[PDB]
Amino acid sequence: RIPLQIVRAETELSAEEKAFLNAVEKGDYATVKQALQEAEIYYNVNINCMDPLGRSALLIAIENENLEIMELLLNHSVYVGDALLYAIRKEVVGAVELLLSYQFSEFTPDITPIMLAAHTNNYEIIKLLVQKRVTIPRPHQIRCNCVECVSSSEVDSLRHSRSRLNIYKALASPSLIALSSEDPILTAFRLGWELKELSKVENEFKAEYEELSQQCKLFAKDLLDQARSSRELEIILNHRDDLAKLKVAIKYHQKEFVAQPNCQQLLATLWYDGFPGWRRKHWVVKLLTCMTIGFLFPMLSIAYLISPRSNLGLFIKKPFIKFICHTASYLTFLFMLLLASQHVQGPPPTVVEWMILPWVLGFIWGEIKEMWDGGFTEYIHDWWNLMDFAMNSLYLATISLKIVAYVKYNGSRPREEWEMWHPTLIAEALFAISNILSSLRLISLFTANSHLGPLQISLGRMLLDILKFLFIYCLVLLAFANGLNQLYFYYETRAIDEPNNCKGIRCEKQNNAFSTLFETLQSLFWSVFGLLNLYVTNVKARHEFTEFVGATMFGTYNVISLVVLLNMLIAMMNNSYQLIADHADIEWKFARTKLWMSYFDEGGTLPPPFNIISLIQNQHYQEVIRNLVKRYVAAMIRNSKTTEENFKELKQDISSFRYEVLDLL
Amino acid sequence: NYEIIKLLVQKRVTIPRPHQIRCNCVECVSSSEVDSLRHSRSRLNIYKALASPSLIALSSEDPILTAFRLGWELKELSKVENEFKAEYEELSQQCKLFAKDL
Amino acid sequence: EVIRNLVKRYVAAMIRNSKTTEENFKELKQDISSFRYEVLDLL
Amino acid sequence: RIPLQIVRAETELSAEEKAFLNAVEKGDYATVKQALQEAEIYYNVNINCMDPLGRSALLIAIENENLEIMELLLNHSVYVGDALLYAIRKEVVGAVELLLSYQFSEFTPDITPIMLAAHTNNYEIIKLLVQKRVTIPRPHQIRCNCVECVSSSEVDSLRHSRSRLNIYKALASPSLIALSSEDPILTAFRLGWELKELSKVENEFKAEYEELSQQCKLFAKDLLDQARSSRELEIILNHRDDLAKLKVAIKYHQKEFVAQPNCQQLLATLWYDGFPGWRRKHWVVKLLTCMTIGFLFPMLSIAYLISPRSNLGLFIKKPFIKFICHTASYLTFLFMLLLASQHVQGPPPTVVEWMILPWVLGFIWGEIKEMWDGGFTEYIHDWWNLMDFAMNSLYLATISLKIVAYVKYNGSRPREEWEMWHPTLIAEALFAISNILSSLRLISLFTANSHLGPLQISLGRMLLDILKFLFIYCLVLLAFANGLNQLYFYYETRAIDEPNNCKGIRCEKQNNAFSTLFETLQSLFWSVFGLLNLYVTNVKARHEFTEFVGATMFGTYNVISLVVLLNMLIAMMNNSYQLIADHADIEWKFARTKLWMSYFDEGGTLPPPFNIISLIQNQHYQEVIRNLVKRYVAAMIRNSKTTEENFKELKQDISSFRYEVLDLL
Amino acid sequence: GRMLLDILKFLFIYCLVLLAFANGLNQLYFYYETRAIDEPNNCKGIRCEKQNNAFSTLFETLQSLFWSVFGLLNLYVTNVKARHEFTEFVGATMFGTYNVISLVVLLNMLIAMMNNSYQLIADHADIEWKFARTKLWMSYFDEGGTLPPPFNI
Ligand SMILES: CCCCCCCCCCCCCCCCCCCC(=O)O[C@H](COC(=O)CCCCCCCCCCCCCC)COP(=O)(O)OCCN
Ligand SMILES: CCCCCCCCCCCCCCCCCCCC(=O)O[C@H](COC(=O)CCCCCCCCCCCCCC)COP(=O)(O)OCCN
Ligand SMILES: CCCC/C=C/CCCCCCCC(=O)OC[C@H](CO)OC(=O)CCCCCCC/C=C\CCCCC
Ligand SMILES: CCCC/C=C/CCCCCCCC(=O)OC[C@H](CO)OC(=O)CCCCCCC/C=C\CCCCC
Ligand SMILES: CCCC/C=C/CCCCCCCC(=O)OC[C@H](CO)OC(=O)CCCCCCC/C=C\CCCCC
Ligand SMILES: CC(C)CCC[C@@H](C)[C@H]1CC[C@H]2[C@@H]3CC=C4C[C@@H](OC(=O)CCC(=O)O)CC[C@]4(C)[C@H]3CC[C@]12C
Ligand SMILES: CC(C)CCC[C@@H](C)[C@H]1CC[C@H]2[C@@H]3CC=C4C[C@@H](OC(=O)CCC(=O)O)CC[C@]4(C)[C@H]3CC[C@]12C
Ligand SMILES: Nc1nc2ccc(OC(F)(F)F)cc2s1
Ligand SMILES: Nc1nc2ccc(OC(F)(F)F)cc2s1
Ligand SMILES: [Ca+2]
Ligand SMILES: [Ca+2]
Ligand SMILES: [Zn+2]
Ligand SMILES: [Zn+2]
Numbered sequence A, D: 001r002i003p004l005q006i007v008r009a010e011t012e013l014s015a016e017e018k019a020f021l022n023a024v025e026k027g028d029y030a031t032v033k034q035a036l037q038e039a040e041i042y043y044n045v046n047i048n049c050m051d052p053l054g055r056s057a058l059l060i061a062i063e064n065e066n067l068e069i070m071e072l073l074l075n076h077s078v079y080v081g082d083a084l085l086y087a088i089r090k091e092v093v094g095a096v097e098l099l100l101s102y103q104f105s106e107f108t109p110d111i112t113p114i115m116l117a118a119h120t121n122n123y124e125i126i127k128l129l130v131q132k133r134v135t136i137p138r139p140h141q142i143r144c145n146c147v148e149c150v151s152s153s154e155v156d157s158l159r160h161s162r163s164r165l166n167i168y169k170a171l172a173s174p175s176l177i178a179l180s181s182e183d184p185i186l187t188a189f190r191l192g193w194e195l196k197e198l199s200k201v202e203n204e205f206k207a208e209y210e211e212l213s214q215q216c217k218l219f220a221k222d223l224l225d226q227a228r229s230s231r232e233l234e235i236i237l238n239h240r241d242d243l244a245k246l247k248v249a250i251k252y253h254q255k256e257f258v259a260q261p262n263c264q265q266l267l268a269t270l271w272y273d274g275f276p277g278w279r280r281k282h283w284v285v286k287l288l289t290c291m292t293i294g295f296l297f298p299m300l301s302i303a304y305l306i307s308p309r310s311n312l313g314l315f316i317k318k319p320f321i322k323f324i325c326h327t328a329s330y331l332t333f334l335f336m337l338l339l340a341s342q343h344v345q346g347p348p349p350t351v352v353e354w355m356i357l358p359w360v361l362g363f364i365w366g367e368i369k370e371m372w373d374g375g376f377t378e379y380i381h382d383w384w385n386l387m388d389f390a391m392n393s394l395y396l397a398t399i400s401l402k403i404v405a406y407v408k409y410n411g412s413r414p415r416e417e418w419e420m421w422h423p424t425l426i427a428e429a430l431f432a433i434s435n436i437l438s439s440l441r442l443i444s445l446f447t448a449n450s451h452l453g454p455l456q457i458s459l460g461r462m463l464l465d466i467l468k469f470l471f472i473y474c475l476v477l478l479a480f481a482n483g484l485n486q487l488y489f490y491y492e493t494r495a496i497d498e499p500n501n502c503k504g505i506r507c508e509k510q511n512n513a514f515s516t517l518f519e520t521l522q523s524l525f526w527s528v529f530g531l532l533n534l535y536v537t538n539v540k541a542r543h544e545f546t547e548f549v550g551a552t553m554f555g556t557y558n559v560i561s562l563v564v565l566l567n568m569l570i571a572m573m574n575n576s577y578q579l580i581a582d583h584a585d586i587e588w589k590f591a592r593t594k595l596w597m598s599y600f601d602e603g604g605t606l607p608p609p610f611n612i613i614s615l616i617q618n619q620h621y622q623e624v625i626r627n628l629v630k631r632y633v634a635a636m637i638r639n640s641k642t643t644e645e646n647f648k649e650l651k652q653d654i655s656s657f658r659y660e661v662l663d664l665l
Numbered sequence B: 001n002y003e004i005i006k007l008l009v010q011k012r013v014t015i016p017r018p019h020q021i022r023c024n025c026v027e028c029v030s031s032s033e034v035d036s037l038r039h040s041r042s043r044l045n046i047y048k049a050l051a052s053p054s055l056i057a058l059s060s061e062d063p064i065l066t067a068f069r070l071g072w073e074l075k076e077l078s079k080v081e082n083e084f085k086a087e088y089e090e091l092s093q094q095c096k097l098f099a100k101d102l
Numbered sequence C: 001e002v003i004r005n006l007v008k009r010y011v012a013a014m015i016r017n018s019k020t021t022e023e024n025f026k027e028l029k030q031d032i033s034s035f036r037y038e039v040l041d042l043l
Numbered sequence E: 001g002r003m004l005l006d007i008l009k010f011l012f013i014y015c016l017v018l019l020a021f022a023n024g025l026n027q028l029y030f031y032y033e034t035r036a037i038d039e040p041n042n043c044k045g046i047r048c049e050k051q052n053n054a055f056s057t058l059f060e061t062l063q064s065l066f067w068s069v070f071g072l073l074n075l076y077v078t079n080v081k082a083r084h085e086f087t088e089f090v091g092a093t094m095f096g097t098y099n100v101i102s103l104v105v106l107l108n109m110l111i112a113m114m115n116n117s118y119q120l121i122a123d124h125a126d127i128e129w130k131f132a133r134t135k136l137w138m139s140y141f142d143e144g145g146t147l148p149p150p151f152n153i
């Protein structure tokens, strides 16, 4: 048998205290009033006694929404400490107004009435508290190093972290931002950004800061959703602290705000400046119009160069037209690259190369102009710039090596006897790599398309899982390469001994697969695709044990890399894709908005190679914001209106009515 | 709500007729240029009203054919209207389900 | 006539399905309080 | 503008009829009574008038659970047609008892009060109706061909199908089976089986019959769940209309009933007859005990043969011991098969073959004994028997060909010059195929294991999707084989012309890949695994267009079969596996129960090759069933107890109370 | 790590299939075993430039069936010097059935299992990781083992 008792004993209530608490719970006003009046004379009942759950009479009255018994207890001067917090958490308006006019706790000591009200996100109570003079402490910098912060962190890390989280929960309240905020949209943007930064910094409590940031983002999107006319939307998006506020939203990665339907509709009307009815057109009509504009891109560029003020001069400044012209220019560049492959050491550039050169110069000039104008952080935040930098550097190296070979060689020697590191060979290799990168650069244009955009977003996301798997794969590969090279480096053979004077795995009969570490890495790589034959694990000597051990290392590597690792990669990608699919549209619309806005600026109008040849505004914004806040508050109250405590309140009301009727009769 | 809809249709009430999906009259382009948000909202509200299963149950000679053609038109609008695509899709699906339930 | 029968049946079925929120509890509290005030005034 | 009017007009209510219906809705008893009394004298209000929703006064009273107004309307003789159906569907006890003591409809004409009550599955109302003399029509056979069935089907298929579904919904009611059923468990078993058969037959309404069958299965499982002692469970499982009822449940594929925890616990206690504490033992102890019993299987078999009544004679009749002995016997058979491969035309059988022969004879004798004892349908329902039949036939063919080669050949001729269809070669090929099948037969033992059982169930399920994909793959394969053979059959070359006198794709240099249809099918098969080289699409003639077209056919086949079809197969399997995973345990426990019960019988005790050398019972069952039904009814009522109409009823009660108080005051 | 359990579970069924087909192929082909001298380069087995004797012995048969999983076993190893076209066809059919099972059926079933298991684990991945990292951190809280090798000796 297990004896069961009370390990942590407490002070039990008396019979009368239990009867009085039961009367308070049942809502019988008459008996509670009689007990309160008798306690003043006889002092037999402690009006501040708790219950087995820790609640006092005032807490019971608050929990039952019994304003009459609550006020009766307040008129008899019961202990009221922290009762305001329970009233605020219960989200009962009568209790807060009753207590505002005047031990164990469920609330941490740093919780204040206004902070708790902001946590509940209850507009009525928050407004009641902000009607007075209340303040919320300002959190320090995310990476602050002042004496107070480090002292509080060292004295009590848990308390300090809890207090910071409570403050940020209060500040991120949509109702508290609706009131007491000059610019709710900008406040939500910057607060969400700061919460995301805190989530990055705070390894723990990461989920809570992430959800607070998401809540701020949704509040900004919902404020934008309350706009009822295009005039209001234009006023909001163009406000300066054009499309200034839209650019600010893009800076803070407010994807839901940017992808809002009305914002996208306005952006689309700006995108198709020339064509008023592009929305309602057939596929063939759109394709023919695009082909015509693309084929006429050089004419539009020349017209802009000569006279910008004409039917053709300013026709290229339209964003969709500019995008078409730039795309057509790049397509012609790629076509010339393809044509460029249809004994002189350092030959002069051909006609195709002479035509290619201005495009390369234009690419370099455009990149450096973007660096000079936009800045450094903006330039780096665009990943494509990395590929653009690689392409430009490879092209510059190609030109340099071509010049070197032109001014250092004159004779015409057959390529068979050229040096391995001859400048022409290196130049051609670099040019071929640049061609690959240039053709691959077309991926970034998938953003412009409805069917290819979200797919590109998804594949981008899956590249992160692929990179994560790359580390473990490379560790395994290096391990087995070390083992195989250690086993086989004794049997290295000269190229002369080979049947065709060819050494390595790129010969018709593969050999010396594991003789050197570099060759071993290549062999293990090519075995992933099955291009390494099994006889490479064989040696001329009759060392059958060595051959078997090498074959077993090779087989274990195959099993791991193919059966285990590749399938695990499929499972990871399969799962990651499923996660991303829900957000694919929002993510795509954000990326497409960035692409569209990149064509709104005056700079960079000409594609290569042609590029080398306040008070009233605030007032309007304030009135629009006031309307938006009213609409949002009404809508969210309606949504919340449209628990066991409700049934408890219903029972309390019925019992109070019953006791009143019974007493009256 | 069938009761309230019936109460209002007991009187002489009308709902404006939406223009063609690819209409190019002066009124449509004028309203689109003056206020695109208001025009799009009004069109969506009208189609939400018309696609109501209760409003099709009353005030419709052939509820099945009305639901068929209204769902088709809503699907076409969903194709044309790049934004608000989800709302037109769900209105079309609602009309299809109403026909199936009839 | 077949369509009339179908519409009657569909309306009845959908009303039944809908019949089979916080505002409901607010309405219940409102009814109870109105009854309480009427009784208190009468007595 | 769209004019909106009432296309299907109706008869509007008068002002007084609307006021009276509003009074009924609000529950004001006094005004409704006054209106009813005034209608008798002045005839100004139609007491049977509908509302805009079609409800009359009685229907409104029923829907609000207002028994007083309901009884008042009944005392004034209002129209009552189909009101009982609305009362039953509302599941209100007072309304049913009120109406039992005494146009458009929401219920089809075939619905009767008892049928609707069974549909609601409400025990109180069903009991109230069964207290009288009520009957439900008996549905005909699933494949009945009488005159009435075909006449009703041809006259009105919709009405007939609806009536049949309504009848089966009534009969499959757990409450209606709890009452009015001699044996609820057997009734649920056979009714679920019949509903599953109807679901197969009825292509439409398949989902409804499937869910009715599942509901019956769950009712049987829940009745078994109410057992409170091992005596009750034994009485239930052993009842005969041992473990008779468990065998009946297995026959009707009642997987949830068989897999119930207490049933599995009892079966486990029967399974480990010899070892009382096998449940609590270490892995090493269990493994050592299994190895010992398995190594001693011949001793146990001989002991059973000599004296069945001894410590060793009857030790093999225990189910787990018998399973271990049979498994060890099969393992030794496979070990001898492996050993059997460590110039005489038709040689005499070796020592290993002489040892193998009695095992084969034992397998054949055991199969024919199972066929003779169990029956034909039971023999066929076991899929493994198909593989057993194939193994036995291949072994018999092997023995026959060995005999033929022994009695038709005496000389010792080298195998190089033997005929292609020499009896010894065919015998060896058949024996090798039999060895493959025999070793593969061990899959069926995965059921016995906790970790391998559910996995085998899942792979079995995935074999159905693989078979489904097999049809489309074979269609594609046949199509492309026809095309490639048509293109290439002109360039067929003789084997002499080949470099090594080898023709076909199994040569070191593959050739004639598509010369014949049979060879083309094999080539397309082996290209799935990449074993067909690309040069087989080349011909000696300089027909570069023909070669290119053949290479394009081959490439399109590769793209389809590998990129498209194989990935689609992965998606199907991936999805099917996810479906099965939830039911994997129940399915596995059913299969393991079948395996365990197969070792409960006296017949087949000896493994190969040693096999070739009532009123009181019903009363007890009835009392146990009565207790189970009481417990199940109480439990399901509790579960149901633990909608907008509830709030409507609350408002109705409050308003009725308010009107009564106001009238009294 | 979690997916390694599903891989181990699949290992048993794969090994059963592999052993079955190795027994069958070795039984069929062990009559045509040839000496290493008869080979073109005095090399016997599947690790030669021209593969041979793929199924002559059980050990070699197991290795051949293993390497066919990665496609490194050529199809001509199912050919014999004698003109026993029926034997060659039966051996090629055993080899093809093994390929179909192990690659089309078993490998895809393994992908489905891993795919499902990964989805199960993903929810608990963080808690599980933090437990493991806590164990790693606590292993460095003790005085013993402060010096890493070779300074610990
Ligand atoms: C010694 C001999 C060597 C011989 C080598 C010969 C072959 C060379 C060919 C190498 C191939 C490189 C492949 C790069 C292709 C990148 C394609 C990614 C496209 C994609 O779906 O994701 C987008 C990637 O954009 C991006 O982030 C930018 C994409 C490119 C970034 C990386 C640049 C690749 C090239 C780097 C140098 C290579 C030199 C070659 C030697 C989305 O992402 P998002 O930008 O919208 O992100 C959002 C906010 N973060
Ligand atoms: C001309 C030359 C030819 C040369 C050929 C050489 C190679 C021959 C080798 C062929 C390989 C056959 C593979 C069969 C393996 C079946 C394994 C299935 C195991 C599995 O997971 O599913 C179980 C299958 O049981 C079952 O349903 C029974 C499994 C076996 C049924 C099919 C029998 C296979 C053999 C048929 C004849 C083959 C002759 C070979 C020429 C579960 O299912 P469950 O029973 O619990 O179901 C429950 C109620 N339905
Ligand atoms: C990330 C860490 C993962 C750890 C996983 C480890 C698994 C290692 C297994 C290495 C398994 C490596 C097996 C292997 O080298 O043969 C080749 C060697 C040399 O020719 O031959 C032998 O080792 C002799 C035995 C041949 C039978 C191989 C048994 C096959 C077992 C599993 C195959 C699985 C295939 C799946 C379809
Ligand atoms: C079930 C029905 C499914 C229908 C699907 C049809 C797709 C058919 C495509 C056939 C695609 C067949 C392409 C093909 O024979 O080359 C080989 C031929 C002959 O040597 O060469 C050529 O045809 C010349 C063009 C070579 C470029 C091939 C372009 C590749 C296009 C797609 C490859 C996809 C690979 C995926 C990673
Ligand atoms: C775990 C148990 C699973 C049981 C599954 C069994 C399936 C066994 C099928 C064996 C299928 C084995 C087919 C096969 O040996 O050819 C090779 C043989 C010998 O060269 O050639 C022939 O058998 C002659 C017929 C060639 C046509 C093959 C038909 C292809 C059928 C299915 C291919 C599926 C590929 C999927 C993309
Ligand atoms: C696919 C193979 C044959 C290579 C062909 C190279 C190019 C000819 C293709 C590859 C990607 C294509 C681009 C993919 C993305 C788009 C977006 C597309 O924009 C739209 O979808 C219209 C709506 C809009 O953007 O306003 C304009 C065509 C374009 C540039 C495509 C132009 C033709 C491109 C460059
Ligand atoms: C796996 C490779 C190396 C082939 C080896 C062949 C056999 C030696 C293996 C293959 C499958 C194994 C069987 C798989 C299933 C079981 C169930 C197992 O039963 C239990 O799990 C104990 C609990 C119980 O069944 O009561 C008894 C061992 C046995 C027969 C195993 C015995 C050993 C077997 C036959
Ligand atoms: N260095 C480079 N900057 C750019 C910007 C746009 C572009 O067109 C494309 F179609 F590739 F996206 C090509 C390039 S290359
Ligand atoms: N023809 C055959 N009937 C049976 C029944 C059980 C058995 O043991 C195994 F371990 F394979 F399941 C083998 C066989 S073979
Ligand atoms: Ca750039
Ligand atoms: Ca059997
Ligand atoms: Zn600080
Ligand atoms: Zn118009």
Ligand SMILES: [Zn+2]
Pocket: D140, D141, D144, D145, D146, D147, D148, D149
């Ligand atoms: Zn009949």
